[PDB]
Design a protein around this ligand. Sequence first.
Ligand SMILES: CNc1nc(C)c2cc(-c3cccc(CO)c3)c(=O)n(C3CCCC3)c2n1
Length: 843
Amino acid sequence: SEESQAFQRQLTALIGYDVTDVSNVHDDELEFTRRGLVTPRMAEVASRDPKLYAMHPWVTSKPLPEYLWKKIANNCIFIVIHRSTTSQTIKVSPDDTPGAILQSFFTDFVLRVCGRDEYLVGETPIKNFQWVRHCLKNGEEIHVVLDTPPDPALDEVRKEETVSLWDCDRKFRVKIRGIDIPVLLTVFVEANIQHGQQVLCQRRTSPKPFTEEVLWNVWLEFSIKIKDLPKGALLNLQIYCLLYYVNLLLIDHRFLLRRGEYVLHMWQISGSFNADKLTSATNPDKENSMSISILLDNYCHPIALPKRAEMPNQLRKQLEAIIATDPLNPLTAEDKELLWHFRYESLKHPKAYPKLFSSVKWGQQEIVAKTYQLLARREVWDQSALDVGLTMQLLDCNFSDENVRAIAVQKLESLEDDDVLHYLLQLVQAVKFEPYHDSALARFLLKRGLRNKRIGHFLFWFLRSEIAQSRHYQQRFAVILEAYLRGCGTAMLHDFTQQVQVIEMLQKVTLDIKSLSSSQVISQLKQKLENLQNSQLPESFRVPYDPGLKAGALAIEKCKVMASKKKPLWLEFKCADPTALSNETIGIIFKHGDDLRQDMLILQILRIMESIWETESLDLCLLPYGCISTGDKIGMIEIVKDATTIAKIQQSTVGNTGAFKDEVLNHWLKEKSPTEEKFQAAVERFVYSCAGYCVATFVLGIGDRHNDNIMITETGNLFHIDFGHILGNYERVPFVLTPDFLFVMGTSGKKTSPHFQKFQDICVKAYLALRHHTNLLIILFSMMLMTGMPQLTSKEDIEYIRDALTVGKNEEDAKKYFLDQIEVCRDKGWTVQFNWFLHLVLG
Ligand SMILES: CNc1nc(C)c2cc(-c3cccc(CO)c3)c(=O)n(C3CCCC3)c2n1
């Protein structure tokens, strides 16, 4: 067709990358995976109920926590329904199915929410809708417009149409031809054979003078049999004088050993591991890039990779100990041989699977074969409750064997939609650790993407973000994105199209205003925004960070540039939907020069932390506001309404002095409060709020923060920001509990009011709570550093979280450690803020 020829052109511009392209391939793996995904794509579209997929209800099957019962009158919730303008309130029991909240209204139509693209459809108790649980949380009313179901019709999709390797015993070899750099020391080539960050054999070449061309024509023989190469092995070519690297999967997506001639353009190094370094893709920029030439031996060569007693006592106990230690504590050789010999005993403990499958010599045919027999007894893994920390450790950079990995992905299949949303950003980042383009995990992101409009909206932007600012991974991601778009359904396809149009204009607008860097500038911003508001910028569009919110007309009146070194737009929008209950605009900040990738990661851990605390019935009140990375150093940011920097509340009654007054904040609070009484709450909300960030900030190692980088709301709730900075470009304090926050709490100097005793008892139940998940957080945090924090890994950075979560110690030993922490705050007072000020305001 040709409606299959122009189509490919919209998809390509939705993606922001041309997949069909070929200038930076050296084989057909990607196309192979495009081919491949067609089936899981069509398998899920065919299989999703067009009804529920149309209204994408947002259900949750977890218990409605404590604080939200102790917030109900009694077994009675209230839901204001709206028609023409004739309102109406109704009684409803927390277990009231939605449709009944109509068979209880007429005694054809589906309940929507007011303002939002959020329906309350489907066979679920209301107790269990997120919006509801959201009203309950912040205490608002539940407003529905009884209106007409969307048309599945609109989600319809466009129309679609040898000698085995275990025979061969010769040490595997690769010939170097040499390298060549079109623009400039001695220099050697390093040729490692890797698997899952294990290094099997290793060779190099004689040094050389560093010249515009260098040739060796050597052969590097390895100490690895051909038959001992494991599926997922990388030839890793490197160049020292370290300067350039590049990789080649020795065994290919077709299970064939790689023989042939290869001209790979090679990746520079900026400035000890880091997810780009793992990539099977090659540098596109040829005119500039170093390159290396090799020969993989040939002939033929179709090859061809195919497919208990008892136990002492000190040993069992040595073994129980090993299973016990955290994900980061390293396995000695004594440890590994121990895990392996008693592997059948190690298989009974899912907790042992990461450590056990890392004791495997993947460079040995027979061992892998044995390991694969180990996976065939996987019944105890299979039965156990899903444990995401455990499931994550087998998906990291340490496991390169798709069988192992696949059983983690099997364990994810059983996450409810609610939880995919919690781990989606990092599961998507997890794709970078997959040796091959098509994977159980790449397919699982596809399935879940296609089965739910909310996961698929976020999957879209997460992937789109990576595509745009990572040339190491765009190819593979672009292929996954494309597969998504070919089956989300015209409707959303059209929606994604509005969103990309709008947010691509606002970006050049933003970069533009930045370039003109004042009275002479407030003018242009107001001027361009009219242009766009004229014809091109379509009427509305989903807010990318909040898929349920459609933004309508701008409001040039309120928009502006800002007094940052860089010049971020403070744009404000009208809600595009009439049914809205209020008239508060929608506020977004476009900014160039922050790596918002890091804020995404950090913000997302924060939500996971809010979710951990919920299992234990706490609520520490965080504001992990929306944030979407759209390109390199560029993206947008939700604006929390009614909030200021803490510094600003200092600049208020002191003003560019830094003579910080221990009292201004509790002042700012009353001034803003409607009463004294609600004001108590703006004190209460602060207590929790503050401890909440104190602990998470401390655990993540981003608690030693600057005063402009903390914020608060006229209604009490406090929250950090701009996490890009710190771990994004980087005499101390653990977190930040300033005399201001203390003063609000009732304490002064060496006194100890009650509210603060509370703050403490919160900082202690909360801090201990996260430690009940040491493993999960360590793996989240450890994957963040590798995939999101460039150059700042080393591992010595990764280990930090170990100390903070205080692995080893008992709860008692723990409750203390953190109160001592809280104490370094009370003892350091202002030294540091005042210190940061002397620094960040002048230096
Ligand atoms: C008004 N409320 C309000 N809400 C929010 C969420 C923000 C967020 C950022 C912000 C800035 C950079 C990175 C990130 C991502 O970590 C967030 C921000 O800079 N500001 C203001 C402080 C200086 C002027 C703008 C905010 N202000």
